[PDB]
Structures are given as C-alpha cells and as structure tokens.
Symmetry: D2
Subunit: 124 residues, 4 copies
C-alpha cells in the first residue's frame, strides 16, 4: 500500500469518536471503533478495504469500513458503513459519508437507514 502507513493509526472524528485501524498491503482494513455519540459504548470491531495503489495525481485514497454495533456490552442491532477517501499531508484527513441501518420489521423498513458524514483527523 502506498498510503498503508498514512492510513494506519488512530483517527478522531468531529464528534470525538475514535477509529483505530491497520491497513494491510493487500488492501485490508482492520481495527476498532469507539463511538462518542449514539447508542454505543466500548470498542467495536471494524473491518474494511482500501485502494492499496491510489492514483498519484494528487487524488485521495478510496476506502470504507463497517462496524456492527454488537460487542460484549451492547447490541444495537444495527451496522454503520463509512465510505470515503484518505487525503494525506500535514493536515491529513479521512473524509466520509456513512449509512447506519437498524434491523427493522418489514413495515418499518422504509425508515431503517440513517445517513450522515464524518471527517476524521489525526488530532483531537
């Protein structure tokens, strides 16, 4: 991975959530997510993928990951996926949009999925 080192480490969103991730040379993302907002608590497992050979034209590095909101302490019966890109440099960022789906009855399916955005930085 060109940005395997850039991505690997700890990231913080604008809400104080904490995203610890290892980027493998094959394109794997693996780590933990600790949410600061919502119906979550400790750490949760995360897995995802990233482009391990990004364009060198100054473009960002596409990636995404999933957290299922079940751990030893909570089950929210829901999952969030983040889709975004890593932008390296002095103020490195991971810019994302996310989809959070809650398990629902078929009658409530139309309102199963929230959408939002998170900006992750290396500081805070």
């Amino acid at each position: 991975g060109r940005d395997q080192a850039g991505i690997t480490g700890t990231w913080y969103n604008q809400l104080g959530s904490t995203f610890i991730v290892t980027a493998g040379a094959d394109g794997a993302l693996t780590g933990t997510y600790e949410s600061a907002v919502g119906n979550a608590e400790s750490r949760y497992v995360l897995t995802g993928r990233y482009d391990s050979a990004p364009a060198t034209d100054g473009s960002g590095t596409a990636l995404g990951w999933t957290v299922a909101w079940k751990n030893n302490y909570r089950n929210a019966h829901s999952a969030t996926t983040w889709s975004g890109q890593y932008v390296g440099g002095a103020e490195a960022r991971i810019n994302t949009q996310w989809l959070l789906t809650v398990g629902t009855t078929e009658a409530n399916a139309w309102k199963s999925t929230l959408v939002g955005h998170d900006t992750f930085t290396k500081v805070k």
Copy 2:
C-alpha cells in the same frame, strides 16, 4: 450467529451482480463481489460485519460490507460500502443502500460519492 447460515451463501442483486459471503459466528463477513455493472470486472474481495444476535421480534439482521474496486485486472480507485439488513424466509432478501466513493482531488471532493440501492436475492 442466528442467521449465520441464512446469510452465508450466494446473493444476486437486481442488476445481476453476485455476492458470495461467509458469515462467521463472531460477526465477520468475508467473501467476494463480482459486479455486473460499472467499471469492474472479475471478483473483488469483500469484508464486513453483521449482527450475530439479531432481535427475534421479526426484525431483520443488520449488516454491511465494503469492496475496494482493485483486483488483478482493474483499479477503479474507488470503494463501495453496502449497509442493509437480511430478511429471512421463503423469499429471503438482503435490502441495502450503498455509497460509492471515488478518489478525487480536493477540488472535486464534493462530487466524490455516489449513492444507490441494491436488493439481493438467493435466485437469479
């Protein structure tokens, strides 16, 4: 996983894409995605997570997964995440929404991310 067997197997979306996945008892999703539409070709690795202890109130099972669109044949410098829920039964379904992010320059970041929806079935 309660629906570890329900989820594990091959799924087909309304476009003919093919989603082969193994659901682990710990909540891991792992498999391959073969797209029928877009700037993709063979199989791509996928990883994700699911709720391995869904509510038994008839609600669906939340899950999501990521594909980075890089394999031995293509690099689209992009990643898609699907967020949705598995609904078991005679006409089992995985109902999803997805976010596709393309690596972009900062000037083009505002248009980096497509949104869509996929319905997966066990047939077709």
Copy 3:
C-alpha cells in the same frame, strides 16, 4: 418543457403513496403528496423543480421536490426531499432517492436524516 406533459399527472410509488404534480414550462413542480407509509396522513403540499429541456440522447429528465410534513392534521416536524429522474415511455417511471430530515436537538443531529428510495409509476 419537453416532458412537461410526461411528468404532469399522478404517480404512485411501490408503497402506495400518491404524488400529484404539475410541471410548468419554466421548470416548476407543484402539487400534493399523500403518503401511504409513516407518520403522515392526508395530502401535503409539494414543490420542486425539473429540467425543462432534457437531453434528447435517451437520458432521463432530472427533477426533485420537497414535502414538509405539516398540514391541517399532522406536524411531523420533518421534511423529505426526493431527487431523481423521469424516464418516459410505455412503462414511464420516476426513479428517486430521498432524504428525510427530522428536527432534532443539536445532541441528536447526527441521527436527524433518513435515506431511502422510491420508484414511481403511472399505475397502482
């Protein structure tokens, strides 16, 4: 409008909701929305815009509209916007994605917005 007549009329989504709209030659959409699902009841006012000079290359006609979920009978303190395109022909369709935002406290803002999709047809 090239599809001013194509768009103008009554549309039904996969849920049984009813969308009655007039497309003006200037690009205005105006009408009423009657929801079949959710925390809504009678008709609600809708307004929006459409491309009154679509490409003739077989492409669809971009449009969108908003409903605020307040009428004489209900106030859900929320608004939905549909973004999509009209596809003419024997099986004419309006294919959309929508965002539903609920008024929230700042603490709950991160979960203010649902995302979904609706397909509208001239029949049902």
Copy 4:
C-alpha cells in the same frame, strides 16, 4: 412561521455558494441559489418547504429545497435537493445533506445520483 424571519435571508455554505431564500408563513421556500463549485454559474431558481410550526423544545426546523441546474446560461441536466434543519441563535446554521441526480441513460442509472453535505451560515 416561527422561524420565518430566522430562515429568510442569505446563507453561505462552506464552499462559498450563496442561498437567498424567502420563507412564507404557509411553509413555502422560494429564492435563488448561486453555486461556487461544480458545473453551474449564475443564479438558479430554488423552491422548497419548511416546517412553519417547529417544536419549541430546542429542536431545529426541518426544511428542504430543490434546484434544477438550468438557467439562461447553463443546463447541467441535473437537479439537487437539500434536506436539513435550521438551527437558530448567535451562530445560526442550516445543516443539510443533499442528493444530486444527473439525467442518464437506463444503463447508467445506477450512477445517476451523488450524495453530499452542506453547512450554511449567515456569514462568509
């Protein structure tokens, strides 16, 4: 409208786009949008709706609006809808998510719709 005066006026997003709007007492939004980014130029008409009787529990005021990207100078054959809420006070904000749909062939429909977010302020 409780926030008819709060909403009415000029708003600027983080990109420098300019959103001039009048909120009617019936819940109408009408105005112009002048984009600073993308394939747009001068002003474009906008119309939308807002909740003219928001909850007084400190919650925001739900609203949305549509711009079709056609004016006397440009036709992008596309439309954007913003869905969000107005938050009053010393640092008043309109927090939104948006969907931009481009008219496409049926073969390209799956990639017709971009998603993003805009934060509007009274300054800048």
